[PDB]
Design a protein around this ligand. Structure first.
Ligand SMILES: C=CC[C@@H]1/C=C(\C)C[C@H](C)C[C@H](OC)[C@H]2O[C@@](O)(C(=O)C(=O)N3CCCC[C@H]3C(=O)O[C@H](/C(C)=C/[C@@H]3CC[C@@H](O)[C@H](OC)C3)[C@H](C)[C@@H](O)CC1=O)[C@H](C)C[C@@H]2OC
Length: 113
């Protein structure tokens, strides 16, 4: 496991092109599944049939995504394990994320613009 900013962990699952990495502000297209530590799924873009898009590195998303996504290359699949302070902190998110939760995201980087 690689330990990056905040103590977020990356487990590399299957490789990308090893050369096309997102830079600050780039639009990324990602499919994800999010689970709690006990393995209980809370959300998935795959279940919606629509990949998620954001600009990375600008605070649109939780800190653990801004930390982890730039370390992936196009096509890569990885698991991000994100401690509470890099996710939803003491507050959580109603109906989905308890207080102080470590979150697990399986992510696939589909495209970079
Ligand atoms: C503008 C309102 C609706 C708007 C909703 C969308 C565009 C649809 C988009 C697919 C979100 C999902 O909708 C099905 C759903 O995704 C989750 O299930 C989820 O897996 C998740 O954790 N994601 C989504 C994928 C990127 C990482 C993370 C996130 O960073 O999400 C971001 C997030 C909530 C950041 C908060 C912002 C407030 C801060 O206080 C907090 O700081 C701790 C962090 C999302 C993208 C926001 O930028 C935009 C929105 O909220 C959340 C558990 C709840 C969230 O629904 C709300």
């Amino acid at each position: 496991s690689e330990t990056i900013e905040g103590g977020v962990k990356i487990d590399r699952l299957s490789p990308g092109d090893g050369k096309t990495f997102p830079k600050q502000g780039d639009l990324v297209t990602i499919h994800y599944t999010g689970t709690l530590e006990n393995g209980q799924k809370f959300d998935s873009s795959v279940d919606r049939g629509s990949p998620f898009q954001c600009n990375i590195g600008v605070g649109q998303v939780i800190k653990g995504w801004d930390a982890g996504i730039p370390k992936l290359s196009v096509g890569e699949k990885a698991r991000l394990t994100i401690p509470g302070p890099y996710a939803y902190g003491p507050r959580g998110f109603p109906g989905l994320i308890p207080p102080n939760a470590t979150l697990i995201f399986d992510v696939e980087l589909l495209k970079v613009n």
